[PDB]
Amino acid sequence: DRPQKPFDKFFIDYIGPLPPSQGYLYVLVVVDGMTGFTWLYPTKAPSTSATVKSLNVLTSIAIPKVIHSDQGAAFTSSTFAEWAKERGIHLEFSTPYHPQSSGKVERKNSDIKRLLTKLLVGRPTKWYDLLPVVQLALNNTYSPVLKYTPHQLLFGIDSNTPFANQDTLDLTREEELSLLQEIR
Amino acid sequence: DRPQKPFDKFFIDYIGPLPPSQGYLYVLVVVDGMTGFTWLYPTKAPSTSATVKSLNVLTSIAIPKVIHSDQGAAFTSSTFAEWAKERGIHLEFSTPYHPQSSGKVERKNSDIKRLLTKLLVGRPTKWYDLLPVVQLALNNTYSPVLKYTPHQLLFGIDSNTPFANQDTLDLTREEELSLLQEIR
Amino acid sequence: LDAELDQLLQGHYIKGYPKQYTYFLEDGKVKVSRPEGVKIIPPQSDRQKIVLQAHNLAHTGREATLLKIANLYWWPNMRKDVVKQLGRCQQCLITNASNKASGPILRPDRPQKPFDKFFIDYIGPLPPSQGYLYVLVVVDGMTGFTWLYPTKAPSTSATVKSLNVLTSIAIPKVIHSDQGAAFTSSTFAEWAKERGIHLEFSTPYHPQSSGKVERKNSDIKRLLTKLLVGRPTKWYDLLPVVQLALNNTYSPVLKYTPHQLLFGIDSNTPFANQDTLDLTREEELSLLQEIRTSLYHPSTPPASSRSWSPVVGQLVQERVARPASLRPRWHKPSTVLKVLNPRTVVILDHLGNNRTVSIDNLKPTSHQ
Amino acid sequence: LDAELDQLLQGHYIKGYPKQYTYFLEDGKVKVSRPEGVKIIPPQSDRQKIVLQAHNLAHTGREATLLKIANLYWWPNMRKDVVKQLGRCQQCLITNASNKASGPILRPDRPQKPFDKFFIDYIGPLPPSQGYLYVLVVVDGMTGFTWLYPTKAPSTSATVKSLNVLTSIAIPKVIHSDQGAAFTSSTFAEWAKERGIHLEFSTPYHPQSSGKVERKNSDIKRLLTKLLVGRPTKWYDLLPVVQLALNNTYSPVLKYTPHQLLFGIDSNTPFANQDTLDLTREEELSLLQEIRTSLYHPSTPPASSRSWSPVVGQLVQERVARPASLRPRWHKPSTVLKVLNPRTVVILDHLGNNRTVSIDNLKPTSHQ
DNA sequence: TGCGAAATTCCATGACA
DNA sequence: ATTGTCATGGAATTTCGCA
DNA sequence: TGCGAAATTCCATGACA
DNA sequence: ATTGTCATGGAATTTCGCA
Ligand SMILES: O=C1c2ccc(O)c(O)c2C(=O)N1Cc1ccc(F)c(Cl)c1
Ligand SMILES: O=C1c2ccc(O)c(O)c2C(=O)N1Cc1ccc(F)c(Cl)c1
Ligand SMILES: [Mg+2]
Ligand SMILES: [Mg+2]
Ligand SMILES: [Mg+2]
Ligand SMILES: [Mg+2]
Ligand SMILES: [Zn+2]
Ligand SMILES: [Zn+2]
């Protein structure tokens, strides 16, 4: 059996509702399985329509052989199935209540939630603007398991934005005080 | 002494008043001395100004060394003299009451008056339109003395409008009847 | 289809499939192990579809289409099938550029005599000067002698007015013009029949055909521009100056001015030439006739390494004249009815009328 | 003046006047009998006036001015005086065309890596599609990989919005653009400093300098036009299709698609190439690094037989950018301060600032 | 070690308005 | 302070298949 | 029968928007 | 049923002036 490659499998999921930011409430998260490269798209709803619109952007840059998701409604609709079939993309579902991706992906998604939350606090309404920098951060983050960043694995070169401050990702005492108050 | 050439001498004169035609009342007549080639310009008055305007057209095609005229007022004014001097054209006058040009020119002017009068009658008001055809007629008229038309002497080729009907130039009994009536 | 690929799997030779490779079955599909790798050999009944899907991805030409196909398939003489499709893609045929140049230009003979042929044309619109916007330019073919008229529009009516003044002096055999509205009107055609003058027209959208007058337009605009430096563009009063200035300017290759070629002697302008001062007019006209016939005449230049010349029966396409944004630059294919000269043809339009057209406004249809 | 022409009449030799001719007096004027005929020899103090009157008749160049003068006069080394005047006629210097071609083009090195250098540019206005009129085109120098964005105007603000989306993926070292309003604004300059991105600009009025992206604009418009044949020009929804179609099209000279040069492997698009199926990603990236460095690179073509190259200290003139009707096509002379490369120079404007300019927008001033 | 045909490479042409 | 580019399809040249 | 310099001719370049 | 042209100024080449 053949080695794993970029575009073999895209893992997708929604994060949200978030506080509204420039009109948007969710983030569709796509992570390439082989490289761990992440793309993020702001949406107004977790709908098939919003997924299709967002994936139409990504799939005008690169098309995965397989999309993996949970059984969210947006992903199990017959429209989303028609969309995928039109593009020769096989759809793949984890069993309900048992969400399974891969070690690398799981960790990546975990990084994503924690990084989001860290930058939310103080400015829970300004995340739309930060999505680019988040992505750069994530995609230039060193992989303990592989010797390389997603950027390096995707393009086979160093990046011009190395993120040498592999960072806290943890909330300071002041920031928990901000987030235990915002949630009041 | 050197042979006579085209542009050595232009003989100019006014014919008119004529019946008004498209606003015009006179014809300034210019005849090259060597070739007998004729140019005609319709004017509203026998003025220096109208002469200058008309000669400005002709002298943007060819400039004579000498202009010969009678002592008409238009030609003896200090303006007309300034005009000629600016163009390096020497002015030349016949003595008052003694108008002298040359055999060839005299005859040419005579042809011009007779041809004009012939085509006037019947349509004394339509001469403006006919001035081109008159000129062609005159300039493609065989010279008894030289073996050539003015056209041939000016350009050194045959013309595409030969006027093989070297014509009456004389008024029929009906046309004198028309002209002894128009003058009543 | 199956017939052919059957005989193959059982080791028999089919013309086109080289014997030295081995042709197995796998996943329900015939395959072959070629030096670049293993490729599927599709049934013939499937090939046109494949070529077409590859081509349609980006409407690519020969090599770029082939390179897609070769990723998955191999079969005998692939490019023959690719080319077959390229020659049938209407969208490619009418949008793509040519890559063949026109054959070398003709240098038509100088008209033999003054007044044999006038070239006429309009310059403008120019900045308004005394209410005037255009200039009618009339150039005598043989001599280069030029007449200028200011007009308010490039109209038949102002053409007619100007030429009634000009033809006072002489009537030309031929007037050559391009297909501007002013010259192609039936009023203008009557004006010329009335006078015995034959109207000759440029092929459409090919100003080079009026090259004689176009080239004089250049000099006119160039001298006007110089005379107007640091002054407001009041050009109306300079037309007569420019006219006389140009008619009395030497062409270095000829050694004569247009005035000289027309009259055989200078008028009283500055620096008049005096060589024939002791000749009679008749001797002078005789020298003029000699000079007129021996003028330098250029020859047809060498063809570029990849030019094409039209052949009767060829498919060729006419350039779209004023193509809209994102619309094709070429009309659908048409046939050469008649080769008038190696640079001018008659084609069976697209409308479909007879149309006489410059080869510069044609491309030969690709892939036959 | 008189000094010189005195010694002459009395048969003494003056340098420049050949002894074998005889030089009489007549009508108050020195004369000489030359093979072409008898010519007046004017006093030197009179010559510049003569040359100038001849030149001014029609602002003629060397030969056509000389031929006028030679009609009446002769003197030693006439053309030296003619040329002296031509080099001082402001009106001729700034209106006449050049007759020297630019030296041969440079082929700058392909950027070594993806994201080393972006070329960006606008296409449009196009027919309105969902309220959109323009397309921002972003081309990666190394790969040719291209991103397309519909906009409502070629504004800084829409450039910034589009590049915030693009730079989500990666940040380029350099963005090269021409001097359009959108790219030269101080807002855009801040946007790039904020990100570590160096802004590189084309010399003004020289689209060839953005050749990388201009050339991709061609292919974009060409594929749009094909896809829109016989349909209304609804291009907005085709941008994404065209983007993917082009990024996955082979260049026949390279044998790779831009997608391949960027990722080293095809995604799930039609006719995906499968040669590295048995390689690990690491082996594949290693092959990609090899392929990236050995790509065909064109060389500087042969100079045309009459080109000029700029020399420090040369007088040269800059092309007028949008010259009014009947106005000169050239600015007044200026000096080459610095030769940046054989096709790019810094000159002392006319304003008079330092200006970095393409040689294609320069002519060398004639007559030194 | 050499032939005819197919495959590949060469490269002038033209458009980025 | 910056710099032309590259798809296209006939033609030229090289390689392939076979002996 | 030959040299240096001047004169003439050659001709690629570019604009007729 | 029609078709490129020719001013320009360096460079190449020829001629001139003298011996
Ligand atoms: O484009 C036009 C055009 C269109 C329509 C007309 O009526 C007309 O007179 C002209 C015209 O002079 N030109 C300029 C031009 C461009 C390229 C050339 F080779 C030459 Cl010669 C002239
Ligand atoms: O004339 C312009 C122009 C003006 C101003 C711009 O901002 C701009 O993008 C362009 C542009 O693309 N082009 C077309 C063109 C013409 C000739 C050439 F060699 C190339 Cl490459 C491109
Ligand atoms: Mg026209
Ligand atoms: Mg024209
Ligand atoms: Mg631009
Ligand atoms: Mg551009
Ligand atoms: Zn096509
Ligand atoms: Zn001048």
Neighbouring-strand partners of residue D73: D40
C-alpha to C-alpha distance for C222 and D89, rounded to whole angstroms: 14
Collect all residues with Cβ–Cβ distance below 8 Å to B125 and sequence separation of at least 6: B19, B20, B21
Helices marked H in chain D: 2-9, 44-58, 62-72, 78-86, 90-95, 156-166, 181-184, 186-193, 211-227, 239-247, 258-263, 281-293
How far is it, in rounded angstroms, from Cα B119 to Cα B130?
A: 8
Cis peptide before A17 (omega within 30 of 0): yes
Residue C85 resides in a domain:
yes
Q: Are C325 and D127 in contact, with CB atoms under 8 Å apart? A: yes
Evaluate the CA torsion angle C151, C152, C158, C164 in order and state its sign.
negative
Rounded to whole angstroms, how far apart are CA atoms A105 and A38? 10
Q: For chain B, list the strands marked E by DSSP.
A: 9-15, 26-32, 38-43, 66-69, 90-93
Per the structure, how many domains does chain C have? 4
The answer, yes or no, to whether the previous bond of D125 is cis (omega within 30 of 0) is: yes
Instruction: Give the residue carrying structure tokens 């991805």.
Output: C57
What gap in Å lies between CA B60 and CA A121, rounded to an integer?
87
* CA C209 – CA C201 distance, rounded (Å): 9
Q: Which residues of C301-326 are buried (b: 16+ CB within 10 A; e: fewer)?
A: eeeeeeebbbeeebbbbbbeeeeeeb
Contact C55, C82 (CB under 8 A): yes
**Phi then psi dihedrals of residue A24, to 5 deg:** -100, 150
Name the 3-class secondary structure at C319.
strand
Of D62, B5, B36, nearest in space to C268 by CA: B5
Q: Would you say D292 and D323 are in contact if contact means Cβ atoms under 8 Å apart?
A: no
- Check whether residue C88 and residue C206 sit in a common domain: no
Supply the DSSP string of D209-247, one letter for each residue. GGHHHHHHHHHHHHHHHHHTTTS----GGGHHHHHHHHH
Which ligand is the nearest neighbour of the Cα of D65? Answer: 8
Gap sites in chain C (C to N > 2.5 Å), preceding residue numbers: none
Are chains C and D touching, using the cut-off of 8 Å on CB pairs and a minimum of 3 such pairs?
Answer: yes
Contact B6, C263 (CB under 8 A): yes
The number of the ligand 2 atom at minimal distance from the alpha carbon of D208 is 21
DSSP element (H, E) containing C218: helix C211-227
Tell me if there are at least 3 CB pairs under 8 Å linking chains B and C.
Answer: yes
- Ligand 8 mean position to B63 CA, how many Å? 23
Within 8 A of D248 by CB-CB distance, chain C residues are 57-58
User: Does D258 map to a domain?
Assistant: yes
- Look at residues C276, C270, C257 and name the one whose alpha carbon lies nearest to residue D63: C257
* Residues of chain D with a CB closer than 8 angstroms to some CB in chain A: 113-115, 147, 164-165, 167-173, 196, 240-241, 243-244, 247, 259, 262-270, 277-281, 284-285, 288-289
8 A C-beta contact, residue D87 and residue D368:
yes
* C-chain residue closest to D39, CA distance: C274
What's the alpha-carbon Rg for chain D, to the nearest Å?
31
**Residue D149 corresponds to which tokens in the numbers above?**
């964005």
What is the DSSP-derived secondary structure letter of residue B3? P
Q: Please tell me the distance between residue C123's alpha carbon and the centre of ligand 4 in angstroms.
A: 7
Same domain (yes/no): C245, C259 = no
CA of D332 to C1' of E17 (A): 28
- The whole-angstrom distance between C325's CA and the closest CA on chain D is 6
DSSP classification of residue C238: G
Q: Quickly count: other Cβ atoms within 10 Å of residue C202's Cβ.
A: 22
Q: Using the structure block, give the residue that is written with the tokens 């992906």.
A: A105
DSSP C83-110: HHHHTT-HHHHHHSPP-SEEPPPP-PPP
Question: Is C327 close to D233, i.e. CB distance below 8 A?
Answer: yes
Q: Do D135 and D190 reside in the same domain of the chain?
A: yes
Please list, in sequence order, all residues whose beta carbon lies within 8 angstroms of the beta carbon of residue A177, skipping any fewer than 6 positions away. Answer: none
What is the SS3 assignment for D74-100?
CCCCHHHHHHHHHCCCHHHHHHCCCCC
Q: Give the distance, in angstroms, between residue C21 CA and nucleotide E1 C1'.
A: 23
Q: Looking at the structure, tell me whether residues C215 and C133 fall in a common domain.
A: yes
Distance C218 CA to F2 C1' (A): 34
Same-domain pairing of D93 and D143 = no
For B1-184, CATH number?
A: 3.30.420.10
Ligand 2, residue D178: give the atom nearest the CA.
Answer: 7
Round to a whole number and report the distance in Å from the CA of C76 to the C1' of E6.
Answer: 9
Is D178 a pocket residue for ligand 2 (Cβ < 6 Å)? yes
Cβ-proximal residues to B1 (8 Å cutoff; 6+ apart), any chain: none
Contact state of B6 with C265 under an 8 Å Cβ cutoff: yes
CA atoms within 13 A on the CB side of D199: 20
In chain D, positions 247-286 with C-beta closer than 7 Å to nucleic chain F are 249, 251-254
Give how far D57 is from chain C: nearest CA, Å.
6
- In the numeric block, the tokens 């409407």 are attached to C59
State how beta strands C174-177 and C117-123 pair: parallel
Q: Could you tell me the CATH number of the domain that includes residue D290?
A: 6.10.20.110
The strand pairing partners of D363, in sequence order, are D317
**Residue with structure tokens 């200028």?**
C148
- The alpha-carbon gap from D19 to the nearest alpha carbon of chain C, in Å, equals 24
Categorise residue D354: left if φ over 0, alpha if ψ from -120 to 50, beta otherwise. Answer: beta
Cβ neighbours, 10 Å, residue C131: 8
**Are residues D134 and D198 located together in one domain of the fold?**
yes
Rounded to 5 degrees, φ, ψ at D88 are: -110, -5
Indicate if C120 and C245 belong to the same structural domain: yes
Q: How far apart are CA D338 and CA D340, in angstroms?
A: 6
CA of C17 to C1' of F16 (A): 12
Residue C231 DSSP code: S
Chain C positions in Cβ-Cβ contact with residue D224 (cut-off 8 Å): 326
Assess whether D299 (CB) lies less than 7 A from strand G. Answer: no
Beta bridge partners of A63: none
Q: Are D338 and D321 in contact (CB under 8 A)?
A: no
Q: CB within 8 A of A119, min separation 6: which ones?
A: A127, A130, A134
Burial C8-18 (b: 16+ CB within 10 A, else e): beeeeeeeebe
Cis ω for the linkage preceding A16 (within 30 of 0): no
Q: How many CA atoms lie within 13 A of D258 on its CB side?
A: 23
Q: Provide the pairing of β-strand B66-69 with D117-123.
A: unpaired
From the alpha carbon of D21, which nucleotide's C1' atom is closest?
H17
Q: Output the known binding site of D for Mg(2+).
A: 116, 178
Q: Give residue D313's region: left, alpha or beta (phi > 0; psi -120 to 50).
A: left
Closest-CA distance, C229 to chain D, in angstroms, reads 7
Looking at the fold, whether C311 and C324 belong to one and the same domain comes out as: yes
Q: Do D270 and C57 touch (CB under 8 A)?
A: yes
What does chain A look like in DSSP terms, one character per residue? Answer: -PPP-TTSEEEEEEE-----BTTB-EEEEEEETTT--EEEEEESSS-HHHHHHHHHHHTTT---SEEEE---HHHHSHHHHHHHHHTTPEEEEPPTT-----HHHHHHHHHHHHHHHHHHTT-TT-HHHHHHHHHHHHHTS--SSSSS-HHHHHHSS--SS---S----SPPHHHHHHHHHHT-
| DSSP per residue, C320-365 | PSSPPTTS-SBPPPEEEEEEEETTEEEEE-SSS-EEEEEGGGEEEP
> Residue C150 contacts by C-beta under 8 Å, 6 or more apart in sequence?
C129, C130, C132, C134, C135, C236, C239
Contacts of residue C64 in chain D, CB cutoff 8 Å?
249-252
Out of C261, C295, C329, a domain closes at C295
User: What is the C-alpha separation between C233 and C220, in angstroms, rounded?
Assistant: 14
Interface test with C, best of D271, D277, D330 (most C CBs within 10 A): D271
Residues with Cβ within 8 Å of B21's Cβ and at least 6 positions away in sequence, in order, are B42, B125, B126, B127, B128, B129
> Residue B53 phi/psi, 5° resolution?
-65, -45
Nearest CA in chain C to B63: C268
Method of structure determination:
X-ray
Nucleic acid strand G within 7 Å of C155 CB: no
Q: Which two tokens stand for residue D309?
A: 């190259």
CA distance D168 to A38: 10
Measured CA to C1', the nucleotide nearest D124 is E17
Quick check: helix, strand or coil at residue B124? coil
Q: Does residue D215 belong to any structural domain of this protein?
A: yes
Choose among C54, C248, C326: nearest Cβ to D235: C326
Instruction: Tell me the residue ranges of DSSP E strands in B35-184.
Output: 38-43, 66-69, 90-93
List CB contacts of D130: < 8 A, sequence separation 6 or more: D150, D236
- Using most ligand atoms within 8 A of CB, pick from D209, D210, D214 the residue to mutate for ligand 2: D214
Resolution value (Å, 1 decimal): 2.5
Specify whether D74 is located in the same domain as D120. Answer: no
Handedness of CA D245, D248, D250, D254 (dihedral sign): positive
Q: For residue C125, say if its preceding peptide bond is cis, omega within 30 degrees of 0.
A: yes
Question: Which two three-digit tokens encode residue A155?
Answer: 């393009």
In a 3-state reduction of DSSP, which class is residue C37?
strand
Terminal-residue alpha carbon distance, chain C? 27
Owning domain of residue C59: 5-97
Q: How far apart are CA C337 and CA C354, in angstroms?
A: 8
**How is the beta sheet containing D174-177 ordered, strand by strand?**
D146-151, D134-140, D117-123, D174-177, D198-201
Q: Indicate which atom in ligand 1 lies nearest the CA of residue C178.
A: 7
Which amino acid, C188? F
Q: Are residues C149 and C210 in the same domain?
A: yes
Chain C residues with CB within 8 Å of chain B CB: 113-115, 147, 164-165, 167-173, 196, 240-241, 243-244, 247, 259, 262-270, 277-281, 284-285, 288-289
Cα gap D339→D341, rounded to integer Å: 5
Q: How far apart are CA C356 and CA A182, in angstroms?
A: 81
CB contact under 8 A, D281 and A132: no
Residues 330-349 of D with CB under 7 A from strand G: none
Q: Is A167 annotated as a binding residue?
A: no
Give the span between the Cα atoms of D368 and D315, in whole angstroms. 7
* CA–CA distance, D31 with D24 (Å, rounded to integer): 5
C241 touches chain D (CB under 8 A): no
Query: Residue A103 is encoded by which pair of tokens?
Result: 């070690």
What are C107's two structure tokens?
């240098």
Asked if D279 and D298 count as a contact pair (C-beta separation under 8 A), the reply is: no
CB A167 within 8 A of CB A156: no
**Helices and strands (DSSP H and E) totals, chain D:** 12, 15
Burial C91-110 (b: 16+ CB within 10 A, else e): bbbbbbebeeebbbeeeeeb
For an interface test with D, the pick among C63, C223, C226, C234 (most D C-beta atoms closer than 10 Å) comes out as C226
Peptide bond into B103 cis (omega under 30): no
Question: Hey, what amino acid is at C151?
Answer: T
- Distance from residue C327's CA to nucleotide F8's C1', rounded to whole Å: 19
Strand E positions closer than 7 A to protein CB = 6-17
Beta bridge partners of D119: D139, D176
Query: Residues D299, D173, D178, A61: is their CA dihedral positive or negative?
Result: positive
Could you tell me if residue B169 is left (phi over 0), alpha (psi between -120 and 50 degrees) or otherwise beta?
A: left
Q: Which residue of C has its CA nearest to B154?
A: C263
The protein residue whose alpha carbon is closest to atom 10 in ligand 2 is D207
Using a CB cutoff of 8 Å and minimum separation of 24, what contacts does C156-161 make?
A: C156/C181, C156/C182, C156/C183, C156/C185, C156/C187, C156/C188, C156/C191, C157/C187, C158/C134, C158/C182, C159/C120, C159/C183, C159/C188, C160/C187, C160/C188, C160/C191
Q: Which of the 8 DSSP states describes residue D304?
A: P
Alpha carbons within 13 angstroms on the beta-carbon side of residue C274 total 15
Please check whether residue C40 touches D, CB under 8 A.
no
Q: Are D162 and D188 in contact (CB under 8 A)?
A: no
Nearest Cα of chain D lies from the Cα of C245 at a distance, in angstroms, of: 5
CA atoms of A52 and A66, how far apart (whole Å): 15
Based on the fold, state whether residues D324 and D200 are members of the same structural domain. no
Contacts of D53 (CB under 8 A, 6+ apart): C270, C271
B80 phi/psi in degrees, rounded to 5: -55, -40
- One domain for residues D179 and D260: no
Q: Kindly identify which residue of chain C lies nearest to residue B131, measuring between CA atoms.
A: C168
Maximum C-alpha span of chain B: 54
| Smallest CA separation from ligand 2 atom 7, residue | D180
For residue A23, the number of C-alpha atoms closer than 13 Å in the C-beta half-sphere is 1
